[PDB]
Amino acid sequence: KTSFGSLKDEDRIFTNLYGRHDWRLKGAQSRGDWYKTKEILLKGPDWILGEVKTSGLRGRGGAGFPTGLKWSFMNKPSDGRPKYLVVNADEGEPGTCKDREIIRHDPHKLVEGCLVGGRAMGARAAYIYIRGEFYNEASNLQVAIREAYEAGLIGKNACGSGYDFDVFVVRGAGAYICGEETALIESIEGKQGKPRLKPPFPADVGVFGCPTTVANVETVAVSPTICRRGGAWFASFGRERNSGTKLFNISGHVNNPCTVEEEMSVPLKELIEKHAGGVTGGWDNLLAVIPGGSSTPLIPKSVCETVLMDFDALIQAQTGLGTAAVIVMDRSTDIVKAIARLIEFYKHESCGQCTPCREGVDWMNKVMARFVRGDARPAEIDSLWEISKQIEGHTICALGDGAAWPVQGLIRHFRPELEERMQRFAQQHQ
Amino acid sequence: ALFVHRDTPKNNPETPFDFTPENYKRIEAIVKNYPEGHKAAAVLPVLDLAQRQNGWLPISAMNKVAEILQVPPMRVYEVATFYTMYNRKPVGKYHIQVCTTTPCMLRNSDSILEAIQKKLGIKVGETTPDKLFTLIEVECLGACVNAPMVQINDNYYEDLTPKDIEEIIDELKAGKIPKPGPRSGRFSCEPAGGLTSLTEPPKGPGFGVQAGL
Amino acid sequence: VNNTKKWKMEFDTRERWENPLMGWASTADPLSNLVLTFSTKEDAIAFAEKNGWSYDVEERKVPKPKSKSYGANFSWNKRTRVSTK
Numbered sequence: 001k002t003s004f005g006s007l008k009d010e011d012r013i014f015t016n017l018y019g020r021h022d023w024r025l026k027g028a029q030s031r032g033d034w035y036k037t038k039e040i041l042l043k044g045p046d047w048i049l050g051e052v053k054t055s056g057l058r059g060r061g062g063a064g065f066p067t068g069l070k071w072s073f074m075n076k077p078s079d080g081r082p083k084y085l086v087v088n089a090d091e092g093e094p095g096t097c098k099d100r101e102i103i104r105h106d107p108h109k110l111v112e113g114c115l116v117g118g119r120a121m122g123a124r125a126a127y128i129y130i131r132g133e134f135y136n137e138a139s140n141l142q143v144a145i146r147e148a149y150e151a152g153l154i155g156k157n158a159c160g161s162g163y164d165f166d167v168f169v170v171r172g173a174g175a176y177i178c179g180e181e182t183a184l185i186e187s188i189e190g191k192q193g194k195p196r197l198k199p200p201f202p203a204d205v206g207v208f209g210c211p212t213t214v215a216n217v218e219t220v221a222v223s224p225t226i227c228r229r230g231g232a233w234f235a236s237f238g239r240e241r242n243s244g245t246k247l248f249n250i251s252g253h254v255n256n257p258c259t260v261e262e263e264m265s266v267p268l269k270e271l272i273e274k275h276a277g278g279v280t281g282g283w284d285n286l287l288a289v290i291p292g293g294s295s296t297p298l299i300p301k302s303v304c305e306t307v308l309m310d311f312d313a314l315i316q317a318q319t320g321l322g323t324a325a326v327i328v329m330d331r332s333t334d335i336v337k338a339i340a341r342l343i344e345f346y347k348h349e350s351c352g353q354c355t356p357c358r359e360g361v362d363w364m365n366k367v368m369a370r371f372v373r374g375d376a377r378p379a380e381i382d383s384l385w386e387i388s389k390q391i392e393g394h395t396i397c398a399l400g401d402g403a404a405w406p407v408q409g410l411i412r413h414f415r416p417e418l419e420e421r422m423q424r425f426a427q428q429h430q
Numbered sequence: 431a432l433f434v435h436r437d438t439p440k441n442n443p444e445t446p447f448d449f450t451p452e453n454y455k456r457i458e459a460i461v462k463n464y465p466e467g468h469k470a471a472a473v474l475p476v477l478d479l480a481q482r483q484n485g486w487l488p489i490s491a492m493n494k495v496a497e498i499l500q501v502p503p504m505r506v507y508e509v510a511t512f513y514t515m516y517n518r519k520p521v522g523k524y525h526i527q528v529c530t531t532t533p534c535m536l537r538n539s540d541s542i543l544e545a546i547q548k549k550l551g552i553k554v555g556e557t558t559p560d561k562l563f564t565l566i567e568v569e570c571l572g573a574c575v576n577a578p579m580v581q582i583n584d585n586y587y588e589d590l591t592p593k594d595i596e597e598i599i600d601e602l603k604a605g606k607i608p609k610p611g612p613r614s615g616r617f618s619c620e621p622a623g624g625l626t627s628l629t630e631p632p633k634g635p636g637f638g639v640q641a642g643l
Numbered sequence: 644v645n646n647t648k649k650w651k652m653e654f655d656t657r658e659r660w661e662n663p664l665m666g667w668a669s670t671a672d673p674l675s676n677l678v679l680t681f682s683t684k685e686d687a688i689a690f691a692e693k694n695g696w697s698y699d700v701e702e703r704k705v706p707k708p709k710s711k712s713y714g715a716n717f718s719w720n721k722r723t724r725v726s727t728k
């Protein structure tokens with residue numbers, strides 16, 4: 001296959017995305033969920049790991065680590081400690097609002113994904129760390145999990161397979177850093193949401209000290225559909241090492257901002273002009289696109305014309321795929337004000353633990369607050385670049401990376417706009 | 431806005447705080463979710479419960495959470511100052527939270543922020559003198575395709591205009607309850623000009639299931 | 644730890660008293676500021692014995708090696724968990 005996009009409704013994993021069907025158990029069983037789950041449990045851990053490795057599923061959290069290789073880190077006998085799946089459901093990324101839709105509209109799919117994932121890794125229970133601001137989504141998911149316990153689908157003797165598996169839901173308390181997997185583990189453990197250092201990886205020392213796999217809602221919820229439809233079905237979409245379907249959140253300056261499930265390697269222009277109703281004012285009104293939520297660098301209109309929305313074609317576009325959250329910015333946008341609001345987000349959501357992020361993200365926000373007004377001189381641009389290069393890869397987690405990267409994208413694609421901002425400040429103030 | 435504590439007569443360790451017996455049963459249900467020897471993992475839910483009974487957190491809810499979970503009180507103070515939901519000051523009865531990050535700012539969230547400000551007569555960070563509305567400005571609330579949006583205590587109000595948010599504030603003042611949804615024509619997150627996908631019926635159980643299963 | 648690398652020879656402190664005019668530290672010990680640097684213990688012992696100085700030697704106290712584990716901060720059943728980080 002060469003061209004991608006135009007995914008059919010028979011090939012969607014997230015049917016009832018929009019809330020148009022019943023989210024509860026009789027609605028979920030009538031759409032394909034909880035079908036032959038006992039056989040998927042009884043065929044073993046290694047079969048499910050082989051199905052996920054066959055499917056080419058990468059980590060839907062945003063980094064794209066191979067999900068089969070990630071879950072196979074738990075494929076080892078116990079040492080007295082229990083083993084845990086932990087489903088990351090914080091989703092604090094600006095641009096990204098898809099896991100809210102999975103929890104709110106396909107909740108039993110996430111429960112069956114917890115069961116299949118925890119069976120594959122030999123886990124004892126699931127901890128769905130939902131964001132605390134998603135309160136109605138959390139109670140939605142708890143009504144679904146009560147339906148799953150009362151139907152005998154989870155808990156003692158889950159799906160009649162003799163396998164015991166609980167599903168716990170822990171609400172957050174309003175910290176974006178608690179979406180990072182070790183900081184999420186620390187937030188589950190009743191501590192400050194501050195990221196641990198790696199090693200130890202959570203497969204060795206995770207939640208409570210136990211072996212633990214933290215995985216996103218989307219990479220967990222597609223796993224029963226991979227185990228039913230097959231690995232070759234999920235590997236049939238997208239390019240090689242870019243396999244599957246993906247939920248996209250096209251927001252910003254489009255006519256119809258929406259969440260839509262789509263084939264993996266779809267072009268960005270086709271996706272925006274097909275599902276979002278195009279950019280407000282036409283495609284020539286396009287200035288920039290942040291392709292995968294705020295952690296990825298923006299790309300200008302000359303890159304957005306032919307770019308494919310998977311991992312490797314966005315690495316080649318010197319950005320990242322991320323959460324596949326498309327933030328569209330038209331020609332009327334004060335783009336330095338938007339990136340400075342974004343760096344302001346990154347200093348308000350930064351847990352203060354290690355030196356480069358705690359100091360340099362506030363120092364970058366002060367530089368960006370002067371760059372919006374133009375109250376600077378152009379030699380501070382490259383200086384700002386070096387400040388980002390003193391945060392990138394010098395931090396504990398990648399929030400420092402995810403704050404250095406928008407600054408790098410803004411400088412790299414809009415240095416002339418910064419310079420004319422500052423020189424018109426200099427002419428009308430000096 | 432501070433992260434130190436000073437003992438006022440309305441916020442001190444002699445301020446009365448105690449859970450209700452139904453809240454003690456809820457706390458026991460929370461504690462039973464975690465392994466034995468890791469009761470400290472119930473610091474974040476129970477303290478949030480102490481915000482749901484009281485509306486905010488004096489320094490008697492933090493010490494009561496520290497007492498009933500057998501954790502040091504500084505380890506509860508850290509959680510109560512780290513996380514942005516724990517109101518360490520008494521907020522109003524309707525805590526309006528406007529998202530002003532970049533995907534909501536691109537779709538003109540400042541118009542709704544100024545609409546709430548001139549509607550209620552307060553600015554960002556203040557409370558109306560009848561103790562009914564606290565307006566603060568929050569980060570990305572996870573409703574980006576429904577931009578712009580606000581949050582009122584549990585409830586997202588999405589796809590908003592200044593007229594819609596004036597209507598919501600008018601029916602919060604009227605003693606009713608508003609509908610937590612997008613105030614535009616759409617329902618949750620779909621394209622507004624019709625469904626661009628998921629128009630076909632869902633295929634039901636047994637569709638495309640591979641053999642040997 | 645760069646000041647723990649070499650051996651040092653000093654002497655016993657004698658009386659320092661108050662200057663009646665200014666309150667300055669008056670001394671009568673010429674060897675009160677004499678600190679000698681040696682690479683090994685035996686060089687310092689040989690230099691003290693050569694000059695007729697009666698000496699006492701304190702052995703080099705290196706710190707014994709520690710056992711450091713970052714994952715020990717987050718154990719399952721041991722007391723070595725950190726209560727916060």
Ligand SMILES: NC(=O)C1=CN([C@@H]2O[C@H](COP(=O)(O)OP(=O)(O)OC[C@H]3O[C@@H](n4cnc5c(N)ncnc54)[C@H](O)[C@@H]3O)[C@@H](O)[C@H]2O)C=CC1
Pocket residue numbers: 059060061062063064065070073090091092093096179180181201202203214295296320321322323397398402
């Ligand atoms: N979904 C969201 O709301 C957000 C997503 N992100 C995305 O998250 C990414 C950065 O997050 P991180 O998890 O810090 O980055 P990533 O480098 O570390 O790690 C992803 C996963 O791979 C696993 N892994 C990688 N190498 C491993 C090894 N050698 N052994 C064991 N496990 C290994 C980690 O355990 C982790 O679960 C970015 O791509 C960013 O776009 C960032 C912010 C918010």
Ligand SMILES: Cc1cc2nc3c(=O)[nH]c(=O)nc-3n(C[C@H](O)[C@H](O)[C@H](O)COP(=O)(O)O)c2cc1C
Pocket residue numbers: 058059060061062063064065067070088089090091092093176177178179180181214215216217219397398399402
């Ligand atoms: C600062 C930061 C915040 C993150 N927030 C989330 C999040 O909210 N939700 C999520 O699924 N992953 C988030 N991640 C990615 C996780 O580290 C982790 O990769 C993911 O939760 C699970 O791995 P997966 O991609 O295989 O699903 C975040 C990473 C960082 C560095």
Ligand code: SF4
Pocket residue numbers: 177194195349350351352353354355356357358395396397398399400
């Ligand atoms: S880089 Fe920032 S977000 Fe990460 S551990 Fe350090 S202070 Fe926390």
Ligand code: FES
Pocket residue numbers: 093094095096529530531532533534569570571572573574577579
């Ligand atoms: S940007 Fe306002 S909800 Fe995400």
